[PDB]
Design a protein around this ligand. Sequence first.
Ligand SMILES: CC(C)=CCC/C(C)=C(/F)COP(=O)(O)OP(=O)(O)O
Ligand SMILES: CC(C)=CCC/C(C)=C(/F)COP(=O)(O)OP(=O)(O)O
Ligand SMILES: [Mg+2]
Ligand SMILES: [Mg+2]
Ligand SMILES: [Mg+2]
Ligand SMILES: [Mg+2]
Lengths: 325, 325
Amino acid sequence: GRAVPGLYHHPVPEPDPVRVEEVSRRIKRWAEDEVQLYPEEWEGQFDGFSVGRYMVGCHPDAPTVDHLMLATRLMVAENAVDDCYCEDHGGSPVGLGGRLLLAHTAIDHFHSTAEYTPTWQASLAADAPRRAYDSAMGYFVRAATPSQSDRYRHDMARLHLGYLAEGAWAQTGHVPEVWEYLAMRQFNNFRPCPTITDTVGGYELPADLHARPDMQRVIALAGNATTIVNDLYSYTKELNSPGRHLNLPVVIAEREQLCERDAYLKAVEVHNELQHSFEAAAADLAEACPLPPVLRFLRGVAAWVDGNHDWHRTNTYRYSLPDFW
Amino acid sequence: GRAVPGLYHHPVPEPDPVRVEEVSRRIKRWAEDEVQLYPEEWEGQFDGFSVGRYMVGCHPDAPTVDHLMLATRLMVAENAVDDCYCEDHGGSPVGLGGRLLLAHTAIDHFHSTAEYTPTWQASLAADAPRRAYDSAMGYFVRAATPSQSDRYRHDMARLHLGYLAEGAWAQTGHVPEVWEYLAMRQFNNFRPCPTITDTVGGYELPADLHARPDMQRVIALAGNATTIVNDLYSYTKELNSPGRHLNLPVVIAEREQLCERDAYLKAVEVHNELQHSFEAAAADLAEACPLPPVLRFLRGVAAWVDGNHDWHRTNTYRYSLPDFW
Ligand SMILES: CC(C)=CCC/C(C)=C(/F)COP(=O)(O)OP(=O)(O)O
Ligand SMILES: CC(C)=CCC/C(C)=C(/F)COP(=O)(O)OP(=O)(O)O
Ligand SMILES: [Mg+2]
Ligand SMILES: [Mg+2]
Ligand SMILES: [Mg+2]
Ligand SMILES: [Mg+2]
């Protein structure tokens, strides 16, 4: 459970085991009883995600487990989609854009005639990814303000666009330029998770404040940094993925023609600059706009980011490190 | 210049020729001098779009030509992308998801390190689609509120997702179910155009009101209806597109195994139900929430929709009708 050497990060408290255990039992019931998420054989993979620790660690300010469950269901649904549609065996399914758009309608609803609406409605139960999105979004919409819901839909639209760029490149084994990879990884990104911190914390960042260019930069930087964290921790895992799975070290090595080690080390330095820039941008906004909802939201994003690093560091079931130090 | 027989629509006044002519000259200068939109050989296609009439007709309440130009630049950029990336010769480019995401960064900016940011910045001038988005969004961002800008980015994310579902299906000649086609056509949709009516009208629909579920349904229905208008007017044109280009009549005919004529006629009935549903949903919201910005926005969406039908009806350069009556 050691951190990537040289990776700039903040330690976090051990997550409340009582909350962890309650989330674990509730998410299991949701997955099995409400959305039929998986067949028996894939239960170990489910528990291996440690989503309870994940979310408790990422949302220390959640007033209740009900609040935590808003994020937990969405996290599990997000994984289910990426696992079932995107990582569909082979490099990338040619029909990904069609599958994702139809799944997207479970988040941003189809509106149509009396004839075609019911047929769409029925598609929402047709597979696990869509049952998962549909149910999870349902809970979110009931608890969050209309603005918080709209905000999440936009961030999900971003995520799906990110998936589709990754999938399009994989169809030809295209290795993008480093900045091009990073642009993709700005969208194919944890962003929809930290941005619901206010909903999960029981308050609202007003839409007009969310929309500020400086806030938008703060959010992008945070997502970018914490997403590269995944690149770093999952690097060894991905060397075994079908084809040549892209992550920052792999793209750096291939484009800049460096050895894997030097490319990985630079990738750590890239993460560090992103993380520091996020923190500086956050401090600047905290000062420029010291409204309580803004300050809470900024603190919650940082907590999510720190929690996300902690979850990656400790998840030895999913991840391990390269021998580069 | 006759309307599709049986198509429910509202007549509109002749657009102010003075405004039309001023938009025409300004958009030509933008296209040629600012963004180098096209080489000489494709000027006829440019003028053939009649974008001046289009926008004046669609935004009767614009206080100035500067306001009209906000929408006009974006319309022209939207076309340029769809023409240059999506209709790239052949059915659909395998790398579409990558090209669109990078173009999307001209709308929703990349945030990164000191090293990679400049390389991204340089990509914004690399082709006409990106010069067009970048410049047009630049003008929009200067004139609109941060919320109006965020709203447009979400609607552009929707549009690009729509492109990618269409492109993914085209890669295998997949004909979706009718409702599946309509779900795609809900995103691959004029929506980003009528939704900027308030910006172009010099006022703001507040974000919290935009976010209301009833408003979201009103917007989706309006976009859905006015987008099927295009299916109907461009049907004959598309019979000549590479492969089998999908539109509502073609999908209805293929899935429900009907002759082209009966499928087209049903497609008109589908349009009509969508249009009526939009109007009823709009009346319901006008009554439920009689705030001035809401009422103006609802009237502007309807004006855009009526204007969009008028532009299709009169554009005999681009469109013609089937002999089905
Ligand atoms: C939670 C969410 C919004 C999306 C899940 C996909 C995503 C954005 C990641 F960053 C997971 O990284 P990766 O796809 O590389 O998954 P890994 O196998 O390394 O854990
Ligand atoms: C203006 C905008 C946001 C996007 C342009 C693409 C689009 C959504 C259309 F509806 C054009 O229809 P089509 O793609 O069938 O173009 P046609 O060739 O029939 O005129
Ligand atoms: Mg993935
Ligand atoms: Mg990874
Ligand atoms: Mg098109
Ligand atoms: Mg058409």
